[PDB]
C-alpha cells in the first residue's frame, strides 16, 4: 500500500523482534532475543469514493484521515468547479488541505 | 586510538594505593547450606591477587 | 586392513596425590602453628607443645625446636622443646 493522499503516510521499516523466556519483571531470569528481522508496516490505506461538483472523485487514504476527506468536500462546496475533469477537481481539493 | 578500560575488570577488582590488586574470595555465591561457618566467613574477605595475574589486570585499567 | 577388533579397559583411574609425610624434622626451628606432620591416623602422636588437628595433622603450639621420639609400644611422638 503506497502513500496516503491526505496525510502523506507511507510504509516504514520496523523490526520483528523474537523473544523467549520469563520477564525479569515477573521474577524471571530475563527475556532472550532469538531473532531480529526487518518487516514493513503499511498505512491502513482505504478507498473513499465521493462526489464533488456532481463528478465522482475517488481518494486513497489511511483510515485515520477518512473524515478529513469528507471535510474537504464540505469546504469545496464554496467553489467554482464545474466542467473540470475528475483529476482537475481532486488536485484542487488537495490544494485546500 | 586511545585505550579502553576493561569494564569487566573494573567491576571485579581494585587497585590499592601501592598497586596491589584485590578481589572478593571466590566460592560463596551459593551451595552454602553445608559450608561451615568458618568457610563462609573467610570467603567474606578480600584477597590480593598473585603477582602474575595481578599485573595483567592492572594493564587493563590504564586510566585507573 | 590393520585395526581389528581390539578391546577396552574396565579400570584405569586413580586419585590425586596427597602430599602426606613429615614436614619438619628433628632439629628444625619452628614457629608456633607450623605444620609438623601430615598423616592418616596417628602414625605419629602429638607430644610436648604439639597439638593434633581433626585430620590427624600435627602442628607446633609454641615457637621452639622439633624433636622426635620412638617410645616403642607407646608409638612415635613429635615434640617441640621451647627455647630460652
Amino acid at each position: 500500500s503506497k502513500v496516503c493522499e491526505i496525510s502523506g503516510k507511507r510504509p516504514i521499516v520496523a523490526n520483528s523482534i523474537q523473544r523467549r523466556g520469563k520477564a525479569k519483571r515477573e521474577g524471571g531470569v530475563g527475556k532472550k532475543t532469538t531473532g531480529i528481522s526487518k518487516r514493513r508496516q503499511y498505512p491502513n490505506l482505504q478507498k473513499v469514493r465521493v462526489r464533488v461538483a456532481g463528478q465522482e472523485i475517488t481518494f486513497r487514504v489511511a483510515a485515520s484521515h477518512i473524515p478529513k476527506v469528507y471535510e474537504l468536500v464540505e469546504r469545496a462546496k464554496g467553489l467554482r468547479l464545474e466542467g473540470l475533469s475528475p483529476k482537475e477537481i481532486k488536485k484542487e481539493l488537495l490544494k485546500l488541505l | 586510538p586511545k585505550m579502553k578500560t576493561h569494564k569487566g575488570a573494573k567491576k571485579r577488582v581494585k587497585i590499592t594505593a601501592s598497586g596491589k590488586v584485590v578481589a572478593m574470595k571466590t566460592g560463596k555465591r551459593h551451595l552454602n547450606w553445608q559450608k561451615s561457618g568458618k568457610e563462609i566467613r573467610q570467603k567474606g574477605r578480600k584477597f590480593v591477587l598473585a603477582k602474575p595475574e595481578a599485573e595483567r589486570i592492572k594493564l587493563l585499567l590504564p586510566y585507573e | 586392513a590393520h585395526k581389528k577388533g581390539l578391546g577396552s579397559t574396565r579400570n584405569g583411574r586413580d586419585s590425586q596425590a596427597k602430599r602426606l609425610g613429615v614436614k619438619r624434622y628433628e632439629g628444625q626451628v619452628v614457629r608456633a602453628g607450623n605444620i609438623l606432620v601430615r598423616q592418616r591416623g596417628t602414625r605419629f602422636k602429638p607430644g610436648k607443645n604439639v597439638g593434633m588437628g581433626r585430620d590427624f595433622t600435627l602442628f607446633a603450639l609454641v615457637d621452639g625446636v622439633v624433636e622426635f621420639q620412638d617410645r616403642g609400644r607407646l608409638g612415635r611422638y613429635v615434640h617441640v622443646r621451647p627455647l630460652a
Binding site: - | 567491576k11 577488582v13 560463596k28 595475574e53 595483567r56 | -
Partner: protein, 150 residues
C-alpha cells in the same frame, strides 16, 4: 657554540632495533620470533592481558562487587577534597578555599575539608568541613575555624 658543537648526551638517542636484516645482526630469518605458531604470525596473539587459550579466565572467574550504577547514570553529589594542616604552612591570616585552589592545593570544583595531618598555626581557615581531630587541633593552637554552608 657552533651548529657542529651541538649533539645529545650519550644515551639520549639510541638507534632503533631492525630485525630481519641478516645473519650477523643477530635478528635475522625468524626475526626474534622463533619458529611458527600464532605468536609468530603477523597479527599474532589474542590480547594476552586477558585471553588464556579458551579456558575460563582468572579475571572472569572472580565475582563482581558493589553498586555498578544504572541508567540514567550517576548522581551528582558534592565532592570533598581533603587538605592537611601540614600543607597549610605556606599561609598567613585568612585561609579561604579560593586561596587553597589558587595554590595548586585544592582541586577546582571540590569543597574543602581540612584533615588533621601535621601541626596547626592559629589562622582563620574557612572550610566546608573539618576532621574531628583537625577541628580541635586548630582550636588548641588557637586558630579560628569557620564552617561555610555556601
Amino acid at each position: 657554540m657552533k651548529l657542529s658543537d651541538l649533539r645529545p648526551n650519550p644515551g639520549a638517542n639510541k638507534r632503533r632495533k631492525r630485525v630481519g636484516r641478516g645473519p650477523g645482526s643477530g635478528h635475522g630469518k625468524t626475526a626474534t620470533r622463533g619458529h611458527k605458531g600464532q605468536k609468530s604470525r603477523s597479527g599474532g596473539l589474542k590480547d594476552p592481558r586477558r585471553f588464556e587459550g579458551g579456558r575460563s579466565t582468572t579475571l572472569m572467574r572472580l565475582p563482581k562487587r558493589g553498586m555498578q550504577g544504572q541508567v540514567p547514570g550517576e548522581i551528582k553529589r558534592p565532592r570533598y577534597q581533603g587538605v592537611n594542616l601540614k600543607d597549610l604552612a605556606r599561609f598567613e591570616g585568612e585561609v579561604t578555599p579560593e586561596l587553597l585552589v589558587r595554590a595548586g592545593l585544592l582541586k577546582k570544583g571540590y569543597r574543602l575539608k581540612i584533615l588533621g595531618e601535621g601541626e596547626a598555626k592559629p589562622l582563620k581557615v574557612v572550610a566546608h568541613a573539618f576532621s574531628k581531630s583537625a577541628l580541635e587541633k586548630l582550636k588548641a593552637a588557637g586558630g579560628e575555624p569557620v564552617l561555610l554552608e555556601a
